[PDB]
Amino acid sequence: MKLSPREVEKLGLHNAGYLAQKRLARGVRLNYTEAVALIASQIMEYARDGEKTVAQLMCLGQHLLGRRQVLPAVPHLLNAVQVEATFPDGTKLVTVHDPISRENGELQEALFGSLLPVPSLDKFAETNRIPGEILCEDECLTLNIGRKAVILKVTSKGDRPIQVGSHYHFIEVNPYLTFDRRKAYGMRLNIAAGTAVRFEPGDCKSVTLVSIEGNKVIRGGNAIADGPVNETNLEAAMHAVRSKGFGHEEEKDASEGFTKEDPNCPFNTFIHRKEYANKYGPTTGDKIRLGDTNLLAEIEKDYALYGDECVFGGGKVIRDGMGQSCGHPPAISLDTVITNAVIIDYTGIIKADIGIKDGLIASIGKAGNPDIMNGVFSNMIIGANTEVIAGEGLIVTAGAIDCHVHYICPQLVYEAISSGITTLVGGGTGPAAGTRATTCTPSPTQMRLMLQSTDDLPLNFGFTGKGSSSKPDELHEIIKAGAMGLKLHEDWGSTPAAIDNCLTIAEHHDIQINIHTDTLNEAGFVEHSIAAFKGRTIHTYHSEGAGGGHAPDIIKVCGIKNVLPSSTNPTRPLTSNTIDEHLDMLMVCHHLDREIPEDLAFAHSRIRKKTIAAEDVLNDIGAISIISSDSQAMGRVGEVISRTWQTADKMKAQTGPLKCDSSDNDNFRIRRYIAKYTINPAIANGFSQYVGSVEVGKLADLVMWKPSFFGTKPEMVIKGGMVAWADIGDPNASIPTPEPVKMRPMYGTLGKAGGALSIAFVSKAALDQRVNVLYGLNKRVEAVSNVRKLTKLDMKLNDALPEITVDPESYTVKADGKLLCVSEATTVPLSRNYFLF
């Protein structure tokens, strides 16, 4: 065969398209992935026939699928489909535009080549909301306010077309443009940023120019007016215009004035809010739908001055001397800048540019050129050494932190980073039996081996040891070796003696203690474990008890002040299929038999509907502060984020807005829930200063999202200022977009680069021992700290302390005397519109 790599990936695309074809043939409404796969594969097959031209397939691709063959969200999620295909002329790109544009598609065209029976149009059932929509006001914003303005008359004496950008210095335009070059000094076109004005040969146009702001320094272009804006440089520029032969004709009666906040001012350029949001992303007061959920994030504020947005492209703002600063020290220029980004964080939902330098979030605010723009600080200068990432219409979020990973395989690392998790904390050594059940890395030899094996991966890593011992010796040994925490587990012995020993060791070493308590109640009930805590800080994994813990009342720990509670994802939210799944999964895990009464009694005592339904409310009100994975140990590493937002959606459906929220937006709920997997795990584990939020000085572990895909599939995962993972298409494509578009690893994953972008979190004892030198780790290594004085009040936005009471018989849960109960959710968002399987 001699198959090249692109043939292999195209064969995978064809297999996905054939799966979509079978599903379409049996009459199900396809989702986004299936529709894209079908359209791409059918375009490839029609190209393989060789009886069509590229334009014919551009027209044909719009007829394959209609609105009735796809889910109601697909027409909004699916704007175009690029694909490469080998015609008789060779490989050609062909792109379908708005492929879903009819009520019904041509199903014979859609299933062509598959040799499957074409289904009748009746087979597609009938039953909406736009994922990622921007809800704007019906207002026209006004650009370039408080500036000196002049309306000039320009005529082209050239024989070729001449576009000029919005921020290009107008006195330095092509010499074959004739106009009053004296009145264009220190001026730029008063038009929307990133747009242009075109002068066809001989064309005559009346333009409006507004003064540049900032330091008012002209650089670049033709070097006609190289220098600050003043009278002497104006005379020098006019002498250069006359000498070098640049078109100049005085217009004595030109119109002069100022741009005002006036609808009837002749110098003002207006732009509708919808057009503004389409061009640069939403501004203050707009709202964003988070995926296909019911949550609306309103932009609390916006750092941009309208008219000076940093837009990169051909003939756009970020260019030499216009939006790329040129006359500044090389060493204050940003390494990277994410432009026009909507930042969702636990602190707020804002619109800003994120400047990244040396792998840290250098600044958040307005970027650009202080020579040309107002409001640009010295930590936000875009220089000639600055890479640009376009955040127009994308959401920037901090990389998620998963604090309950079982290192059972290295493929869960790829699955986690592909979903936007940049930090894993947990324990394990592989698929050994001890780590399938526990997040313990027992041996120091295994600690060294796991720190060495994960050294090249572009994630932050933290490993915990086995704290289930009644004497402190081996705990000291494993903390000294690199363990940043200890784990008490029922399978090693989670008795009160072990709890006391592990907690005094934690107070000695300033590490966090994770506990999975005794489900059998063999040494005592939950009150005796709480007594063993002795008021000391402790993190409780899966505090509900579905993952495990004192049957039935482990959930009482959500009311204790010194206990930091967390939840695992497989119960988030309660749904119709949750109990059967969890019961029989528990039976599989524990090798239990349904036919023996004791085994089924244990299973039913441990998997409880009422206590999970209470867990949902406790997550909503802030009594549970962290949502983790428990990966491959009753947990899914790639669903910490999505499941969290699903919970939020459910709690808006069945409880309405929170008290702090209103009918306008869901900003407080969004902040509370995004804190559960970004900042609260970081505070709990003791590395809050490095990761967990989009804050200046923190590591640049960022995740880009389309608002239509928020919570399911990110556009790219940036690790330490470099793109670690991203959605990319065919490597042999003419552009990056053509199918198959997969979440692939980028240059941040190769060589010794992935270690240069990330941190290995260890204990203070291990860093004092310089385990990064002993083990030969290329990664950065930092010590965890500030975890022993923590109470529930330190969890951001999740500091509630209800008085929990569980009935021993009926398992009814009351918080402050009020019953906690929520209905089962028959559906969830962020699941079915997005995933092939």
Q: Of the candidates 72, 116, 562, 655, which one interacts with a second copy according to CB under 8 A?
A: 116
Among left, alpha and beta (phi > 0; psi -120 to 50; other), residue 790 is beta
For every residue of 333-359, DSSP letters joined together read: S-SEEEEEEEEE-SS-EEEEEEEEETT
Q: What is the nearest approach in angstroms of Ni ion to the Cβ of residue 106? A: 39
* Residues 758 and 780: beta-carbon distance below 8 Å: yes
CB neighbours of residue 808 within 10 Å: 10
Nearer of residues 259 and 501 to a second copy, judged by Cβ: 501
User: In angstroms, rounded to a whole number, what is the distance separating the alpha carbons of residues 753 and 778?
Assistant: 9
Q: Is 406 in the site for Ni ion (CB under 5 A)?
A: no
654 is an interface residue for a second copy by CB under 8 A: no
478 within 8 A of 527, measured Cβ to Cβ = no
Number of residues that bind a second copy (CB under 8 A): 255
Q: Which does 319 bind (CB under 5 to 8 A by kind): Ni ion, a second copy, none?
A: a second copy
Contacts within 8 Å (CB) and 24+ apart, 4-11: 5/731, 6/730, 6/731, 6/732, 9/730, 9/731, 9/740, 9/742, 10/44, 10/730, 10/740
645 is a contact residue toward a second copy (CB under 8 A): no
Residue 443 or 689 with smaller CB distance to a second copy: 443
630 marked ligand binding residue? yes
Q: Give which of Ni ion, a second copy, none residue 749 binds (C-beta under 5 to 8 Å, depending on kind).
A: a second copy
Distances in Å between the Cα of 685 and the Cα atoms of 187, 343, 426, 540 are 54, 24, 10, 12
Binding mask 812-831 for a second copy (x = CB under 8 A): -------------xxxx--x
63 is catalytic: no
Asked if residues 177 and 247 have their Cβ atoms less than 8 Å apart, the reply is yes
From Ni ion, a second copy, none, interface partner of 775 (C-beta below 5 to 8 A by class): a second copy
Residue 322 touches a second copy, criterion: CB under 8 A: yes
By CB under 8 A, the residues from 148 to 207 that bind a second copy are 158-165, 168, 172-176, 196, 198, 200-201
Map the footprint of a second copy across residues 77-106, applying CB under 8 A.
Answer: 80, 82, 84-95
89 binds, among Ni ion, a second copy, none (CB under 5 to 8 A by kind): a second copy
Q: How far is the CB of 834 from a second copy (least distance, A)?
A: 8
- The β-bridge partners of 149 are 210, 257
CB 361 within 8 A of CB 696: yes
The residues in 597-626 that bind Ni ion, with binding defined as CB under 5 A, are none
The contact pattern for a second copy, residues 733-752, with x = CB under 8 A and - = no contact, is xxxxx-xxxxxxxxxxxxxx
What does 694 bind: Ni ion, a second copy, none (CB cut-off 5 to 8 Å by kind)? none
User: Segment contacting Ni ion (CB under 5 A): 124-132, 546-554, 638-646, 649-657?
Assistant: 546-554
For residue 663, which amino acid is it? Answer: S
Which of 62, 495, 665, 680 is in the footprint of a second copy by CB under 8 A? 495
**Cβ-based nearer residue to a second copy, 453 or 791:** 453
The catalytically annotated residue of 63, 167, 539, 590 is 590
Query: Of 494, 226, 219, whose CA–CA distance to 372 is shortest?
Result: 219
Give whichever of 548 and 573 is closer to Ni ion, judged by the CB atom. 548
- At residue 200, the 3 state secondary structure works out as coil
The binder of 723, among a second copy, Ni ion, none, by C-beta within 5 to 8 A per type, is a second copy
- DSSP character at residue 614: H
Residue 153 in marked binding region: no
Using Cβ positions, the residue closest to Ni ion within the complex turns out to be 516
Q: Is the Cβ of residue 3 or residue 120 nearer to a second copy in the bound state?
A: 3
Nearer residue to a second copy within complex by CB, 78 or 364: 78
Q: State the pairing for strand pair 395-398/336-344.
A: parallel
Which of 575, 619, 564 is CA-nearest to residue 815? 619
Judge whether 248 is annotated as a binding position: no
Min dist CB 800 to a second copy, Å, is 26
User: What are the distances in angstroms from CA 690 to CA 352, 526, 527, 695?
Assistant: 21, 35, 36, 10
List the one residue from 450, 560, 612, 700 that touches a second copy (CB under 8 A): 450
Compare residues 548 and 745 and give the one whose CB is closer to Ni ion: 548
Nearer to a second copy, 622 or 748 (CB): 748
**Annotated binding residue 489:** yes
Q: How far is the CB of 546 from a second copy (least distance, A)?
A: 11
Sole binder of a second copy in the list 3, 108, 261, 595 (CB under 8 A) = 3
126: buried, middle or exposed (CB in 10 Å: 19+, 13-18, 0-12)?
A: exposed
What is the distance between the alpha carbons of residues 97 and 77, in angstroms, rounded to a whole number?
Answer: 13
Per partner kind, with CB cut-offs from 5 to 8 A, the member of Ni ion, a second copy, none near residue 187 is: none
What is the C-alpha to C-alpha distance for residues 567 and 556, in angstroms, rounded to an integer? 13
> Pick from 319, 516, 672, 706: which binds Ni ion (CB under 5 A)?
516
Minimum gap (Å) between residue 663 Cβ and a second copy? 28
Q: How far is the CB of 621 from a second copy (least distance, A)?
A: 23
Beta strand spans in 366-502 (E): 387-390, 395-398, 400-406, 421-427, 460-466, 485-488
Site for a second copy in 360-399 (CB under 8 A): 360, 378, 383-390
In one letter, which amino acid is 359?
A: G
- Does 582 engage in binding with Ni ion (CB under 5 A)? no
Residue 214 CA to residue 373 CA, distance in Å, equals: 5
CB–CB of 667/297 below 8 Å?
yes
Residue 227 partner contact from a second copy, Ni ion, none using kind-dependent CB cut-offs of 5 to 8 Å:
none
CB-based contacts of 682: which residues, under 8 Å, 6+ apart?
401, 423, 688, 690, 691, 692, 693
Contact residue for a second copy among 103, 284, 808, 818 (CB under 8 A): 808
Q: Is 773 in the site for a second copy (CB under 8 A)?
A: yes
Q: How far is CA 720 from CA 27, 398, 655, in A?
A: 46, 12, 39
Site for Ni ion, residues 524 to 543, rule: CB under 5 A: none
User: Could you give the angle at which helices 496-509 and 473-480 cross, rounded to 10 degrees?
Assistant: 40
Rounded Cα gap, residues 323 and 193, in angstroms: 10
465/548 with CB nearer Ni ion: 548
CB proximity list for 595: less than 8 A, separation 6 or greater: none
Shortest distance, CB of residue 701 to a second copy, whole angstroms? 15
Distance of CA 626 to the CA centre of its chain: 18
Site for a second copy, residues 36 to 65, rule: CB under 8 A: 36-37, 44, 48-50, 53-55, 58
Q: Is position 516 annotated in a ligand binding site?
A: yes
Options 126-134, 262-270, 655-663, 764-772: segment touching a second copy (CB under 8 A): 764-772
Q: Are 615 and 624 in contact (CB under 8 A)?
A: yes
Which option in a second copy, Ni ion, none does residue 101 bind, with CB closer than 5 to 8 A by kind?
A: none
Total residues contacting Ni ion by CB under 5 A comes to 3
Residue 457: which of Ni ion, a second copy, none does it interact with, CB under 5 to 8 A by kind?
a second copy
Q: What's the rounded Cα separation, in Å, for the pair 37 and 40?
A: 5
Of 207 and 405, nearer to Ni ion (C-beta) is 405
Judged by CB under 8 A, the residue of 11, 140, 793, 819 near a second copy is: 11
Judged by CB under 8 A, the chain residues 518 through 537 that form the site for a second copy are 519-525, 528
Q: Which of 378, 367, 357, 379 is nearest to 318 (CA)?
A: 367
Q: Which strand (E) or helix (H) includes residue 53? A: none
* Residues 6+ positions from 773 with CB-CB distance below 8 Å: none
Quick check: 632 binds a second copy (CB under 8 A)? yes
Q: Which of positions 389-448 make contact with a second copy (CB under 8 A)?
A: 389-390, 407-412, 414-415, 418-419, 429-437, 442-446
Annotated catalytic residues are: 590
User: Known binding site for substrate: residues?
Assistant: 489
Site residues, Ni ion (CB under 5 A): 516, 547-548
